[PDB]
Amino acid sequence: GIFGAIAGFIEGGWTGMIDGWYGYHHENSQGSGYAADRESTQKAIDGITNKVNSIINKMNTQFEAVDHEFSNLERRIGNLNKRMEDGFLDVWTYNAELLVLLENERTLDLHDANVKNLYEKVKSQLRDNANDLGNGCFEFWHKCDNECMESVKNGTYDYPKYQKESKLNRQ
Amino acid sequence: GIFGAIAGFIEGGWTGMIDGWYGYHHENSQGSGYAADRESTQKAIDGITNKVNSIINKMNTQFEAVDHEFSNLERRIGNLNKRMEDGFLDVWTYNAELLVLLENERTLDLHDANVKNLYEKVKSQLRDNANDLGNGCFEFWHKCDNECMESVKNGTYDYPKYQKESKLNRQ
Amino acid sequence: GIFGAIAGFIEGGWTGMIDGWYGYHHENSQGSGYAADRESTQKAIDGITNKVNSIINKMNTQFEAVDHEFSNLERRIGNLNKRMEDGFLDVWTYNAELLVLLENERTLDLHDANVKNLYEKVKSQLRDNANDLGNGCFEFWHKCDNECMESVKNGTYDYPKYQKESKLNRQ
Amino acid sequence: DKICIGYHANNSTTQVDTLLEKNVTVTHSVELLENQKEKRFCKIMNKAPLDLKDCTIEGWILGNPKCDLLLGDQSWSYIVERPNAQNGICYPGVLNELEELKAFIGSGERVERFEMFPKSTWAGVDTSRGVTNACPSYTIDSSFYRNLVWIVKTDSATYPVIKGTYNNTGTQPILYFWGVHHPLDTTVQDNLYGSGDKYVRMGTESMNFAKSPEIAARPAVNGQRSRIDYYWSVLRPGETLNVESNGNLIAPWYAYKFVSTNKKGAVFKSDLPIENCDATCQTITGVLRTNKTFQNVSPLWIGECPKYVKSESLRLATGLRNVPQI
Amino acid sequence: DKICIGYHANNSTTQVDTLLEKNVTVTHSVELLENQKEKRFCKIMNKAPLDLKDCTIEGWILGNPKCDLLLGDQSWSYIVERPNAQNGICYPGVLNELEELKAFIGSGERVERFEMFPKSTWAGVDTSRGVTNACPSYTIDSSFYRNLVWIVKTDSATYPVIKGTYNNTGTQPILYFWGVHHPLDTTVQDNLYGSGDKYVRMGTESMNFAKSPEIAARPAVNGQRSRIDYYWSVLRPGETLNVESNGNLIAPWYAYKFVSTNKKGAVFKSDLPIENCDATCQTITGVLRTNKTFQNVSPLWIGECPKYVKSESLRLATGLRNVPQI
Amino acid sequence: DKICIGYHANNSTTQVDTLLEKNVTVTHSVELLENQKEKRFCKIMNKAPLDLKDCTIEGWILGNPKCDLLLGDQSWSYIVERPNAQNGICYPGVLNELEELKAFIGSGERVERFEMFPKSTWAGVDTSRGVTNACPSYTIDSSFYRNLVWIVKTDSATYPVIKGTYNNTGTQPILYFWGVHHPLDTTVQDNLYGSGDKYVRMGTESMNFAKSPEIAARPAVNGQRSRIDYYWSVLRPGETLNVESNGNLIAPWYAYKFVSTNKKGAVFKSDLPIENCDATCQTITGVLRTNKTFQNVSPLWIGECPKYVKSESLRLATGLRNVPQI
Numbered sequence A, B, C: 001g002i003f004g005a006i007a008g009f010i011e012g013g014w015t016g017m018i019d020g021w022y023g024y025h026h027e028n029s030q031g032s033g034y035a036a037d038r039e040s041t042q043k044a045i046d047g048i049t050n051k052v053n054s055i056i057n058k059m060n061t062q063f064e065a066v067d068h069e070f071s072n073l074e075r076r077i078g079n080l081n082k083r084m085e086d087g088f089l090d091v092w093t094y095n096a097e098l099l100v101l102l103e104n105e106r107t108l109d110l111h112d113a114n115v116k117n118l119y120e121k122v123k124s125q126l127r128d129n130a131n132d133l134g135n136g137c138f139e140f141w142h143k144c145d146n147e148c149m150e151s152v153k154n155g156t157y158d159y160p161k162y163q164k165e166s167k168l169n170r171q
Numbered sequence D, E, F: 001d002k003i004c005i006g007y008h009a010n011n012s013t014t015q016v017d018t019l020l021e022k023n024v025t026v027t028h029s030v031e032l033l034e035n036q037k038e039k040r041f042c043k044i045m046n047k048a049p050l051d052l053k054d055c056t057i058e059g060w061i062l063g064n065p066k067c068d069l070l071l072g073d074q075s076w077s078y079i080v081e082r083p084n085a086q087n088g089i090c091y092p093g094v095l096n097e098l099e100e101l102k103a104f105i106g107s108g109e110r111v112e113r114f115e116m117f118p119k120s121t122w123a124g125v126d127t128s129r130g131v132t133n134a135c136p137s138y139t140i141d142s143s144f145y146r147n148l149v150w151i152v153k154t155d156s157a158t159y160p161v162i163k164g165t166y167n168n169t170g171t172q173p174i175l176y177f178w179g180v181h182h183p184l185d186t187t188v189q190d191n192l193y194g195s196g197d198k199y200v201r202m203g204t205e206s207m208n209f210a211k212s213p214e215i216a217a218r219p220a221v222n223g224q225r226s227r228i229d230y231y232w233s234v235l236r237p238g239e240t241l242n243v244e245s246n247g248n249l250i251a252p253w254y255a256y257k258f259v260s261t262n263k264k265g266a267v268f269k270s271d272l273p274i275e276n277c278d279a280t281c282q283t284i285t286g287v288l289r290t291n292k293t294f295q296n297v298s299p300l301w302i303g304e305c306p307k308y309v310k311s312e313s314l315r316l317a318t319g320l321r322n323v324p325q326i
């Protein structure tokens, strides 16, 4: 995809992570588990919901065909009505089908970007205190307990705190 | 946002930088200041201006309703005219409102990407001669005077020139 | 551009690479040459072809004007037909011209992203076994023969194999 | 010790198309289009439709003797006319501006039938013998329209100038009908109306009407080579109608107080059953009970309906590309 | 020593909506839609509109005696007709193909009035007594249309065949009018036109017209139970009109050289004031002075106007998400 | 030792526009719009068009004596009418519901001419002298329409009631024509039809027609101050026509079995040559031979054509921004 994450450098999704669209899987001495990133997921839910509702609202008018009849000597106005009604039917069918194809492409890209940005946000915090495996996973050069893990996930990871310990194991 | 810079890893904008959309803030012995990146800003102004003018040009036709009257025995053609006029009014209202929502989303993304790309362009020049603070700021491992600063801004920064000095301070 | 690669940190294209949209140029003891990345190129050809065919399919209806005549006492319905026919002509002209401008912008961005993602994919494999020159080129810290080159291109490059040799030359 | 960044996958097999790619499986999506219908007619806004059954629109408001089931007051949310309905214009002839009449009736929600011109209106003529075997009732072989009076001359006497007037003092417009008889030959002409140039003339503040009989033989229809020219008009509130004729007049007898709807009007020509049920959206081919934005059922409807398109499906992705492992 | 990359912020509180997010504050934006109007009528291309004031279109081109202010030559960029205008068809009757006549007049920019048939045209009849209390002037109680002549028989004499002809040798089409009188009874018929079957017949290279009087009493309007059938037509350049009648003719007297516009035509029905001002875009509800692309004022206009939509606002972002610190 | 990532460039100078940028050179692109045409008419679905040449539509189906080249059976994929065609309605008069007649004929693909009423049909009258110098053949100065019979009285005798009937027992509708003669004066009226009130009355199961002559002098056209009112109708399968007249009848003689097309119908008014060639898409201004999606040639066409737009070009980028070095 466009941002290279979904079905990209992160080859597949997690059926194990059921409570959000994007998130984390950690492993430490206390074991392993899945956790959704609540902020990025909710932000995406709000955006996508807004998109759907906006499309619904813009599509909220109707063209109305009539039951009116035309006589044998009214072929021209009868045909005028038919071509008009068919005309708007073709316009709106086009508008609906084209929009769906376009927005589906962009919606999937949006998800792709959000995963990529989440990955970058973690990379940025950890720096050289961890090793990037290239598949969205990071191996710590230090022991990272549950609160250390949670600090990574909520954006408050303390790089200086683990720097020296990481440097020693790295070297 | 989609590219992660605006209201992203760069949390906020600069009211201090009044002469461009994207740019720099530097600090050295001679003090500190804001400067717009003229090239990226102008390129964006040209693009966005072109987009606005293109939308205006495509919207440059008008459907025209008429003042024509219809008698009591012309209910069908009278109603035909009304549904037609209402029909085009609904189509164009849709076209205008949907386009504005779509383009506003993409325009903001464009700005987001340009900031991200500007950040990358600086990161690429500086390499390990500077420390990336994660907020769009770089701390030099060497003294960088006004001409050094300006070389970073105009893309001609000399990495080898400051390499040895940076290496020593880094280590 | 939006992803910063095409006419970006990779300043220009290769007339030398004639068999694909994206790819590689290598140099080693056995000489130098161009090679297309077949997977990313084909994936893009499939996508773009699908886009063109989808646009063609959505544009596959026609509004039909008629040869019908109207008398001197049929000015109103005659004018109704004209404004209707002109109305749909304006709608479809708008739809076609706007779509082409929009999709051309996005198609070029798609190519830009694919080049960027290809670059990232190589950067990720090589790590510090090579030096990034900032122009899409990587200089190996080790000898990389034809099969090493091909392993980089097909995603199976062996970082541990060349690690020690690269480390020594790097230091 | 490890942490990984990743994304949701599930067991979804639901797919969407994009400009770049067809058949993409996604974790979540929403279908915007409705393709299901209940094949029946229901009430709209708690108001039942009018089933014309074996009568056509003409048979109904003209008062064809076999349409007595419909006769009188009616209220409707819409009209259902059956395709093979047999009871229309029984005595052969053209109902003028028929399509406009249907459009008018369709724009209404109620008619109240009343006697506009009692037979006493027409002084020197016979109002009791205007029946024909072309227009049978269910019980008698020769009858006539309940809203019209076929006037003929009294025995041997001449057919005099007859006059009638009606002042609409009410607040509602009045839909009424009348006719001009065209006999197949001068013999029938003299037998029924006597001799001399005949005319039918009518007028209001805004309308003039004048017609004379045109004697000729047309192919037999329902046993008749003669014809009637039927007409309709609308007497506005405050307007007065004047009728004047010296013969060949099919006179207005009963008419309708007409109540025009502020909503959309509909006339559905269908064989579908009307059942005891409610609906907010009624199409000519059935009821739509849906929250969806689009529908591919029918462009013809009354009530609040989704937008009609030709599409089979309009599914939006909301979730992401579904890539479950394994 | 530091360098940072960043983006512009300012004091803007102006917001836009996107598909993903509503109420987004941006540093720069442009409003594409115009919602302001000047509530008045101005000149279009330095040409003033025609105010019909207390006269309707019919009163004007028929020459209703109370419309003398309008009488004669007129040039206009568009027409303003006032809603409560009282001076129309004074002597009761229908002006046939009225809607088409309005559409035709609307397609013009100028009429030149001239005498098409001087009263001398009609030999054996009286052209001096055709007045009625239904059509008063401002100074006299009984008058008539300035463009028509109500012809009656001379004292006691019979009403003969009268004839008239006009050959349009000019380069412009001619808009003209005529009528057929329908008396309420045979007494008035004989008093005015004598006895015998009456006709009005007219023709050109491309038109035939024939009508006879239809005697009957209609509800009184402006004191009259009689009626006139008014007619109009257009005599093309090079065409000739022949008039022939033995009675009941409301004759053409004055007509108009008609100049058709190459621009759009307009007839605005409004109470808005016409002032001394210029405009490039004039809608039925007011002037638009704007550089904007869209407008939500009115779909009805003349001149160069923005596209009409129902939208309240169409604001495009040009700058970026405004995130000022603090 | 080096490896670089990069992208394709070539010698393309072909450009596209985007929302952000005009005149962008791209390595690959596809033009969606067709602006080329063959300026000629070809066959559509192996079926040739009908060239009316020097005859108009009226001249053709009325049977103007100078249109004998067209006379009889015709099959067509579409109709070409030439702008300066001279042979139309030769004896002056109006063909009623002309525009509807053209729309009807346009909806057809074939007519079969047959004798509907042989001259023997009309008993007491003369069918041999109905010719006029207004309607010359190519060989004789005075002729008449091949599909009509101008009936006049026999020497000195009165003009009696004539009658005719035709029962359409076939499966195809029948297009037929008739007329009513209006002499310039009572002298011609008496000379041709004798004295007394004259009528023309016709009828079917679904149609009534009645007209009487209207005597008056109109400006001379093709030497005639008299007129004919021409009429047309369609006799449905199973319907019967009855004709009855005591004078002034231009009688139906030959008529057409009418075959209606299921495709789109077209009547192209053009000077373009019809050649020996095939096409799948034929516009009024020429043939389109293209695989393209849009065209800016013409909105008027028959066959399978690209969508018409006003655009000069609709080029989609498929490849990428072309940035060749050097």
Ligand SMILES: *[C@@H]1O[C@H](CO)[C@@H](O[C@@H]2O[C@H](CO)[C@@H](O[C@@H]3O[C@H](CO[C@H]4O[C@H](CO)[C@@H](O)[C@H](O)[C@@H]4O)[C@@H](O)[C@H](O[C@H]4O[C@H](CO)[C@@H](O)[C@H](O)[C@@H]4O)[C@@H]3O)[C@H](O)[C@H]2NC(C)=O)[C@H](O[C@H]2O[C@@H](C)[C@@H](O)[C@@H](O)[C@@H]2O)[C@H]1NC(C)=O
Pocket: A146, A147, A148, A150, A151, A154, A156
């Ligand atoms: C992002 O995620 C991190 C990790 O989970 C979270 O930080 C933890 O927050 C909790 C609760 O605020 C902290 O628990 C308290 O810890 C203090 C500090 O003493 C201990 O921690 C230090 C390390 O900083 C050790 O060196 C010491 O030896 C101690 O083990 C402790 O005093 C306190 O106990 C008092 O308060 C209790 C309240 O229930 C009371 O019951 C008790 O009797 C005591 O009076 C808590 O036990 C935990 O230490 C934090 N971990 C770290 C590594 O800092 C972030 O949330 C908070 O972060 C802290 C730093 C504050 O800034 C709060 O305002 C944050 O809300 C979380 N951030 C976000 C934004 O979600």
Ligand SMILES: *[C@@H]1O[C@H](CO)[C@@H](O[C@@H]2O[C@H](CO)[C@@H](O[C@@H]3O[C@H](CO[C@H]4O[C@H](CO)[C@@H](O)[C@H](O)[C@@H]4O)[C@@H](O)[C@H](O[C@H]4O[C@H](CO)[C@@H](O)[C@H](O)[C@@H]4O)[C@@H]3O)[C@H](O)[C@H]2NC(C)=O)[C@H](O[C@H]2O[C@@H](C)[C@@H](O)[C@@H](O)[C@@H]2O)[C@H]1NC(C)=O
Pocket: B146, B147, B148, B150, B151, B154, B156
């Ligand atoms: C991107 O931004 C950089 C930084 O501002 C800019 O480079 C500077 O450009 C200016 C003007 O071209 C240079 O000023 C001249 O410097 C030379 C060199 O001597 C001094 O610099 C070197 C470092 O390279 C020191 O080691 C020496 O000790 C000196 O201090 C100097 O000879 C010259 O003086 C002559 O010319 C004067 C003209 O007014 C004249 O008055 C005087 O009497 C002398 O005859 C200038 O003073 C400055 O040195 C550059 N700085 C650096 C670090 O290189 C880039 O613009 C130019 O860059 C140089 C390298 C050239 O390639 C020009 O073509 C560029 O235009 C700027 N680039 C872009 C693209 O915007």
Ligand SMILES: *[C@@H]1O[C@H](CO)[C@@H](O[C@@H]2O[C@H](CO)[C@@H](O[C@@H]3O[C@H](CO[C@H]4O[C@H](CO)[C@@H](O)[C@H](O)[C@@H]4O)[C@@H](O)[C@H](O[C@H]4O[C@H](CO)[C@@H](O)[C@H](O)[C@@H]4O)[C@@H]3O)[C@H](O)[C@H]2NC(C)=O)[C@H](O[C@H]2O[C@@H](C)[C@@H](O)[C@@H](O)[C@@H]2O)[C@H]1NC(C)=O
Pocket: C146, C147, C148, C150, C151, C154, C156
């Ligand atoms: C991505 O690109 C790489 C590089 O081109 C490619 O890997 C090469 O694949 C070829 C063919 O599969 C290998 O050639 C065989 O090599 C074996 C191994 O011995 C030699 O290689 C090792 C290094 O691994 C050296 O240390 C030794 O000293 C040897 O030089 C060799 O036994 C074999 O010879 C037998 O098979 C011949 C079949 O024709 C037969 O003729 C002969 O008599 C022998 O019985 C081949 O010569 C080559 O070594 C690979 N290079 C490397 C660096 O691994 C990838 O394709 C394959 O990769 C290997 C590792 C397997 O996993 C295959 O399944 C892959 O298809 C390519 N990958 C993709 C996905 O395109």
Ligand SMILES: *[C@@H]1O[C@H](CO)[C@@H](O)[C@H](O)[C@H]1NC(C)=O
Pocket: D011, D012, D013
């Ligand atoms: C998917 O799994 C859920 C349980 O999480 C199950 O209830 C549902 O039936 C499954 N649906 C499909 C389509 O596999």
Ligand SMILES: *[C@@H]1O[C@H](CO)[C@@H](O)[C@H](O)[C@H]1NC(C)=O
Pocket: D015, D023
């Ligand atoms: C993909 O779409 C095609 C349409 O050609 C359909 O036949 C097929 O069922 C789809 N494939 C799936 C659902 O795996």
Ligand SMILES: *[C@@H]1O[C@H](CO)[C@@H](O)[C@H](O)[C@H]1NC(C)=O
Pocket: D219, D220, F167, F168, F169, F238, F240
């Ligand atoms: C018309 O022809 C059919 C078929 O022969 C016949 O049954 C019918 O009686 C005829 N009707 C008339 C009115 O001639």
Ligand SMILES: *[C@@H]1O[C@H](CO)[C@@H](O)[C@H](O)[C@H]1NC(C)=O
Pocket: D291
């Ligand atoms: C009806 O529409 C709502 C709108 O959000 C949707 O969420 C809901 O699932 C739909 N109802 C059913 C029963 O599917």
Ligand SMILES: *[C@@H]1O[C@H](CO)[C@@H](O)[C@H](O)[C@H]1NC(C)=O
Pocket: E011, E012, E013
């Ligand atoms: C914004 O600030 C400018 C000064 O830069 C001032 O002139 C203007 O009034 C302010 N506008 C708003 C809307 O705050």
Ligand SMILES: *[C@@H]1O[C@H](CO)[C@@H](O)[C@H](O)[C@H]1NC(C)=O
Pocket: E015, E023
């Ligand atoms: C956001 O838009 C809402 C519309 O519901 C409006 O009421 C409100 O003023 C806006 N909020 C602002 C301008 O802060």
Ligand SMILES: *[C@@H]1O[C@H](CO)[C@@H](O)[C@H](O)[C@H]1NC(C)=O
Pocket: D167, D168, D169, D238, D240, E219, E220
């Ligand atoms: C109609 O009735 C009203 C109300 O009584 C009356 O004032 C008016 O004179 C009547 N007009 C006619 C023509 O009968």
Ligand SMILES: *[C@@H]1O[C@H](CO)[C@@H](O)[C@H](O)[C@H]1NC(C)=O
Pocket: E291
């Ligand atoms: C009118 O439109 C121009 C078009 O660019 C715009 O720049 C200008 O600000 C507008 N004029 C005013 C007075 O706002």
Ligand SMILES: *[C@@H]1O[C@H](CO)[C@@H](O)[C@H](O)[C@H]1NC(C)=O
Pocket: F011, F012, F013
């Ligand atoms: C481009 O180069 C090809 C050879 O690769 C040549 O055949 C062709 O004529 C050239 N076209 C243009 C437009 O330069």
Ligand SMILES: *[C@@H]1O[C@H](CO)[C@@H](O)[C@H](O)[C@H]1NC(C)=O
Pocket: F015, F023
């Ligand atoms: C760019 O487009 C312009 C349109 O104004 C055209 O005149 C010119 O030829 C184009 N430039 C090229 C093809 O280099």
Ligand SMILES: *[C@@H]1O[C@H](CO)[C@@H](O)[C@H](O)[C@H]1NC(C)=O
Pocket: E167, E168, E169, E238, E240, F219, F220
């Ligand atoms: C009409 O006037 C022209 C120009 O003088 C003349 O040639 C022509 O004969 C006239 N025709 C009639 C019918 O008066």
Ligand SMILES: *[C@@H]1O[C@H](CO)[C@@H](O)[C@H](O)[C@H]1NC(C)=O
Pocket: F291
């Ligand atoms: C006609 O259209 C096809 C559709 O793919 C296209 O590939 C081909 O190049 C076109 N033919 C010619 C001769 O250009």
